[PDB]
Amino acid sequence: QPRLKERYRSEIRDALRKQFGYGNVMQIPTVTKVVVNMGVGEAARDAKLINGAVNDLALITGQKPEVRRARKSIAQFKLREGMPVGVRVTLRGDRMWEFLDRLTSIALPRIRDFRGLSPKQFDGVGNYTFGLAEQAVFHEVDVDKIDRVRGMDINVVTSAATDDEGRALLRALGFPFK
Template sequence: MANATAAVAGKNQPRLKQKYRDEITKTLTEEFGYANPMQVPGLVKIVVNTGVGEAARDSKVIDGAVKDLTLITGQKPQVTKARKSIAQFKLREGMPIGAHVTLRGDRAWEFLDRLLTLALPRIRDFRGLSPKQFDGNGNYTFGVQEQSIFHEINQDQIDRVRGFDITVVTTAKTDDEGRALLRALGFPFKAE
């Protein structure tokens, strides 16, 4: 047991995860009165998703979306294929129509840190995130209109502007717990 603890202590933890363990768990325990430390809401995963409707007409478009997601998240995305054919959209079953990445563990913490400290402040006329976009179970989803807010994307090599949906999945039972967790992590919510 001591060897396992030493191995974990020697490993470099993401900055936000360290802050969560040291400060945020105590704050949330006091705020909501949890009896057990396992009741404190935590981060499960982050899903970054992009839909590419033009891929139905031009199959090369999906490659740009996959490349952008790979640069932003550091992980190869899964290509989303159409589940059924829709004639009006000239869409056939099995055609690529988007891509998504699921980040867990340290990668999720590092992505969240980069998102909050580097990417969101680069959005033009940014007034904060809406605090009403919770799903009822403490999970938060928001959209980003262009990929250029991420430092990993080279501005000169953007073929077209792409938006992303980012879903932060937590273990929170209610929206209030999820909101308190994300606010403590540094999410810039608008004043209600």
């Protein structure tokens, strides 16, 4: 039993019924999936992302990601239709809560000169998205087994209906906001 999931249905599940006037317990917001992709656009030349962007998100998240192909061909990028350009993993269930636990506790507050994450980054539904700068804090990867740096951006998808409804869900989970 992961510790953030049991803490979710201990006080977070109850605190939102007082802050927001829900009549039913089925209206309570909950994060459903967390999506992490690299998006290695420097893979249209020499095609070296198999060792790079696959063997690290397998170490960060816990399951091997999906090599994604291009939809159409754009000439200014040397990008042909049917060429690996992005690498995406999807986290559900126990591995979702154990990724957000390892993110907020030890990974996210060790960015160099970290002053929070912007609370203006909600889409209009209640789904949150931020980015990272480099092959990040995540201690499962080391310098002995990495190539060049690459960044990721992380989608957090909740069942909330509006922005502050989903912002208040992520406050109790442990996302910092400035």
